[PDB]
């Protein structure tokens, strides 16, 4: 609670929507990504970069809605633990698509293509979660 004060009040004004507009941005950036044919490695890096950044952001926002509210009271409402779990899955997929490849053999995971499509769908379900 010593810091829970200064954080939980920073997570309002105007992080309320910026965060949301940033989700719209994300989906838009993806649609552009998937629509541009034959983009180079360098263009691809560039758009992968913007996707990761925007994902890193959403990740921090969530180590604050937890540091600030506290492990147990966010975590009580499992409804928010969905939207939180969602963030984490997509961050993991994106980190690997955009940067951590080609270490993925090491994960021993298969189904990589559907993992991806999943994580793209999840970004949309994030707004759907929003009433």
């Amino acid at each position, epitope marked *: 609670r010593v810091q829970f004060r200064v954080r939980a009040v920073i997570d309002h004004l105007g992080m309320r929507v910026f965060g949301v507009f940033l989700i719209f941005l994300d989906i838009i950036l993806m649609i552009i990504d998937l629509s541009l044919p034959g983009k180079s490695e360098s263009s691809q890096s560039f758009y992968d970069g913007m996707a990761l950044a925007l994902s890193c952001y959403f990740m921090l926002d969530l180590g604050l809605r937890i540091f600030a509210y506290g492990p147990k009271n966010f975590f009580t409402n499992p409804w928010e633990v969905a939207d939180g779990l969602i963030i984490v899955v997509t961050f993991v997929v994106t980190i690997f698509y955009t940067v951590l*490849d*080609e270490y*993925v*053999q*090491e*994960t*021993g*995971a*298969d*189904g*990589l*293509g*559907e*993992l991806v499509v999943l994580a793209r769908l999840l970004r949309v379900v994030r707004l759907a979660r929003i009433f």
Partner: antibody, heavy 119, light 108 residues
Framework: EVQLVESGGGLVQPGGSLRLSCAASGFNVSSSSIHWVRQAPGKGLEWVASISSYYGYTSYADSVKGRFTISADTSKNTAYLQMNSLRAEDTAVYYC????????????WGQGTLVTVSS | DIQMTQSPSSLSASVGDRVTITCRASQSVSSAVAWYQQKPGKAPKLLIYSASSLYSGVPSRFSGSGSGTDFTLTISSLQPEDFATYYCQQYFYWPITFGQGTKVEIKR
């Protein structure tokens, strides 16, 4: 246990048609991916077509686009490949094979069926 | 489309030897690579998926590695029953492609 039983092969004149069949047991066509891959006698493996019913998703090799059609009767747990306008280059052993879904490795093949295209 | 350039197209090694087979992909396919073994007049069987995961029940002498776009099947104590042809495939982009194969002969 997983089994895939192909039938429908054999001898056929150029211009003609055949309908291969693959009978599935041990898993469900309706949620899996079925592939047909072929092998011209003495040569490598050429992928031909795939279906993942769950997504209304099929796909084809260019050598075959337009002439062959893949499909599944999800209630007979069977897949089919309809082959029209056969040419001699289509002579091959035609293998049915499966994977968990479309982005997962193929993990099982049938013993295949011999298609011979000749006058 | 994507090519899997695989070599050597054939090799001959003794029982107990460690053989290496290589497959280069024309562009990154991540870890969607699989290796198959095919004995003469039989359906291929799967050995490795995601580049390096041993498929269940396959003898562990068979292993796979990824380096960028270079894939390696290693058979590390060659047994006489390992005479076969080994095909790499990528299944990341479409169409699915196979390398031309390595035809392994056992030196006795």
């Amino acid at each position: 246990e997983v089994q895939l039983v192909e039938s429908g092969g054999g001898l056929v004149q150029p211009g003609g048609s055949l309908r291969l069949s693959c009978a599935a047991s041990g898993f469900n066509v309706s949620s899996s991916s079925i592939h047909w891959v072929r092998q011209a006698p003495g040569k490598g493996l050429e992928w031909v077509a795939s279906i993942s019913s769950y997504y209304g998703y099929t796909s084809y090799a260019d050598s075959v686009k337009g002439r062959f059609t893949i499909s599944a009767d999800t209630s007979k747990n069977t897949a089919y490949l309809q082959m029209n306008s056969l040419r001699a280059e289509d002579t091959a052993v035609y293998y049915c094979a499966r994977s968990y879904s479309w982005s997962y490795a193929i993990d099982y093949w049938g013993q295949g069926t011999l298609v011979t295209v000749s006058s | 489309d994507i090519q899997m350039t695989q070599s050597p197209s054939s090799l001959s090694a003794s029982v107990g030897d460690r053989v290496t087979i290589t497959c280069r992909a024309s562009q990154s396919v991540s870890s969607a690579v699989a290796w198959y073994q095919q004995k003469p007049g039989k359906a291929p069987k799967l050995l490795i998926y995601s580049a390096s995961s041993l498929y269940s029940g396959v003898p562990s002498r068979f292993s796979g590695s990824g380096s960028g776009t270079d894939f390696t099947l290693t058979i590390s104590s060659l047994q006489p029953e390992d005479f076969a042809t080994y095909y790499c495939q990528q299944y990341f982009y479409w169409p699915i492609t196979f390398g031309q194969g390595t035809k392994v002969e056992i030196k006795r």
